[PDB]
Amino acid sequence: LYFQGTRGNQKIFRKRMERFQEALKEKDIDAAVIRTLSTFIYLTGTKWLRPSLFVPAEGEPTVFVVKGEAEEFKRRSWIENVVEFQKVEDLMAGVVKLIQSSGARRVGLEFGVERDAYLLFFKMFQRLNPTVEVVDILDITMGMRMIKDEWEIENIRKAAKIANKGMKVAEEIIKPGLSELEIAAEIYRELMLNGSEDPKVYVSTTPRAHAEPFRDLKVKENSVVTVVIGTDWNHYYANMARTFVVGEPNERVKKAIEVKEKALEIALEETKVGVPLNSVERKLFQFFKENGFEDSYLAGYTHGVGLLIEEPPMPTIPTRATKVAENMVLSIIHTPLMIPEGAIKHEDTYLVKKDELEKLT
Amino acid sequence: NLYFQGTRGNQKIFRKRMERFQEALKEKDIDAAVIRTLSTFIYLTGTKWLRPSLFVPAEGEPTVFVVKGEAEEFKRRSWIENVVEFQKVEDLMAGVVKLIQSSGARRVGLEFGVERDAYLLFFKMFQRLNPTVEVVDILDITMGMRMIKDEWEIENIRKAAKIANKGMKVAEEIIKPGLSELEIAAEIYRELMLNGSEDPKVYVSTTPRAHAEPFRDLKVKENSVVTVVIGTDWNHYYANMARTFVVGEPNERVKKAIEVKEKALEIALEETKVGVPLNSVERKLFQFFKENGFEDSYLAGYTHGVGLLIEEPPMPTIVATKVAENMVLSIIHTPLMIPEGAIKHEDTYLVKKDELEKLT
Ligand SMILES: [Mn+2]
Ligand SMILES: [Mn+2]
Ligand code: NA
Ligand code: NA
C-alpha cells in the first residue's frame, strides 16, 4: 500500500478487524474481549490506555475509554462505537451488556503475556457471565500478526534505523566509570527524540539475560558492556543488541566471542523458508557442544518481532514445530552466551524473504 | 545488627519480611506461595531480578529461579541462598511444579496482580499442570504487609520524591508551544535516570487523558494546558506527583477547573485521616464535584497507596480498609477532565498520627 498517512490509513485496520471476525466465526466464538495492548493497536490502529476493545463475531466493535477521551481517540481510529465511563465498574458492566445483547455463548480472551492480560478481569468475567465459556484466542490474534504486510515491514524498517541511532549513542559514550543507568539514559533520550514512543534499553556490566540497568554498576577497564535495544515506530519494534569490549578482553571473553560469531553464521545460513526452528536449534546446540560450551547453551535463538519486541514464533511454557515462513520478521541471535564477564550478545532484526534474510538493523 | 543502612538496604530487612510472610501463609493454611510479581519479589528478596520467580514454602527456605550463569550474581545481591538455574523457560515451569509436588502442597498462593509477571498465560499453564492444587489469591497478604511502611521504606520514598521534584522542575523549564509530548517526556526521563531512578514513568498530555503516555505527534499549542505525571523510584520505591501547566492565557473553564481542584484537594487532605475508610472520602469528593457543576468531569479513585508500585492498594473500590499510620498515599490521583486537558494536582503523602506529611 502506497501514500499511507503518518500512522497508516484507517482501511488497514478495518481489513484486519474483518479478517479477525471471520477467524472468530470459524472457531464458533461469538465475541472477543481484547485487553492486550499490542492486539488493541493491531485492530484499532492506535495505542490507547487502558486497552479495552469488544469485538462481536458479527457487527461493529466497541472501544471503552474514560470520560473526556472519546474525541481524541475517534480522531485517531476508525472505530465509531466509543463508550466513556467514569468508574472501572462501568466498564465490566458495559462488557456484560454487550455480552447479553449479542447473545454470546463462547467469548474469546487473550491469555497473553502483556498488559492488560491480568487475572482479575478473567475471574470477574466468569462470575458475571456464568453461561459463557471463556476460550483463549492468543493463537488467533498472534496467528494474524506473524506474517507482516508491506506497511508493517516499512514501520519495522524505520524502527531499525532508530535503533541504530540509539546504538551509535551507546558506542560513543561507553567508557570506564559510567554506570549502566547513565548509559541507558542517553540511549533512551535519543530513541525518544527520534519518535519512538515505548523504547526498552538494557545495559549490562554483569551477566544478566534481562539487563534492566542499575544506578550503581559501573563500566570497568578491560571489560565488556552489553546493550540491548527494542525501539518502535508506529508501535512496531526493531530489536538489536551489541557487545562492546572496553579495553583489552581476557582469554575467556575472546573465546566466547569467537564461538558466538560462529554460531551467528550458522543461524543465519540455516534460517530459511520452510525450515523448522528446532532444526536450527539442534544445529546451534550441537555446535556449542563440539566447542566445549555445552553448559553455556540457552534455547531460543530467535523470536518474532512486531507490535511486541518478542512475539511468536518464540519459546514458551511443544505440539507441532514452527517453520520459517516468508515475511516473518525475526530477531537473531536473541540468546546470550553467559560468562562471568557478561552476557555475550549480538542481535539484529531480519526480514525473511523468499531466498534470503534481509538485515534491517 | 546495625541501624546504619547500606545503600540498597541491609539484608536483615528482607529476611524478616520473608519470615513474617511465611507466618501469614501458615496462619491462612497456605502450603506455599509462588511470587511472580516484580514488586513483591523485590520486597522479599531485596533485589530486582528479571524475570521474578520466587517460591516460598510455608516452612523452610525459599528458592529463586534464574537463568544459567546468573546465580552467582544474584547471590551477591540478595540474602536468598537457594538459587536454581535453568537453560529453557520450559525447565523453569517444571522446576516450580517439582517443588510443589515433592512437598505435597494442596493450597498454593498466587498474587492476582496487575503487573509483570502476573499474566494470564502462567496462570493457565499452572492450573493445568497442578490440577489437584487450589490456587488462592494472596495479594491481600502481601499488600497487608506492604501498605504499612517501615522507616527505611519511608526514607527511600523521601529520596524518590526529591528526584520527582527534579524531573518536574525540568518539565516546568522546557514546556513551550511547539514541543511534542514525547520531546518533553524525553528530557524529564533523562533527568530522573541521571539522578538514580531505575524504572521511572512519565506522562505528558496536551489532550485530556488519564493514562497519558506521550505521543510523538501531539504538540503544545499556544494558550493550552500541559499535564505532567511522574512516578519515579529510589531503591525501587516510588513517589508520585502531577502538575498542570498553563501555556499562555488560561480560559475561563480552565481557571474554574483549577479552583475547583484546589477546593477538592483541601477536602481530601482534611478528611483522609487515621481510622477513616477511603470510600467515605471518595463519596465526599463526588458530592463536592456534583455540587460545583463538574459531575461530568469527575473520575472515581481519588487516592492510592504508593510503594514498590506507583499505584498499589489501598484504593477506593467497590465491594473495609481504614487509613492507618505509615501508609503512603498519592492525592489527588484522578484528573478533572475538561476538553482542554486532564486537570491534575497530585503529591505523595505520609500518613501521620494527626495529619498527612507531603513528601513531594
Ligand atoms: Mn530479543
Ligand atoms: Mn497516581
Ligand atoms: Na474516527
Ligand atoms: Na547473598
Automatic annotation (TrEMBL), chain B:
<protein>
    <submittedName>
        <fullName>Proline dipeptidase</fullName>
    </submittedName>
</protein>
<feature type="domain" description="Creatinase N-terminal">
    <location>
        <begin position="17"/>
        <end position="148"/>
    </location>
</feature>
<dbReference type="Pfam" id="PF01321">
    <property type="entry name" value="Creatinase_N"/>
</dbReference>
<dbReference type="InterPro" id="IPR036005">
    <property type="entry name" value="Creatinase/aminopeptidase-like"/>
</dbReference>
<dbReference type="InterPro" id="IPR000994">
    <property type="entry name" value="Pept_M24"/>
</dbReference>
<dbReference type="InterPro" id="IPR029149">
    <property type="entry name" value="Creatin/AminoP/Spt16_N"/>
</dbReference>
<feature type="domain" description="Peptidase M24">
    <location>
        <begin position="155"/>
        <end position="352"/>
    </location>
</feature>
<dbReference type="InterPro" id="IPR000587">
    <property type="entry name" value="Creatinase_N"/>
</dbReference>
<dbReference type="Pfam" id="PF00557">
    <property type="entry name" value="Peptidase_M24"/>
</dbReference>
<dbReference type="InterPro" id="IPR050659">
    <property type="entry name" value="Peptidase_M24B"/>
</dbReference>
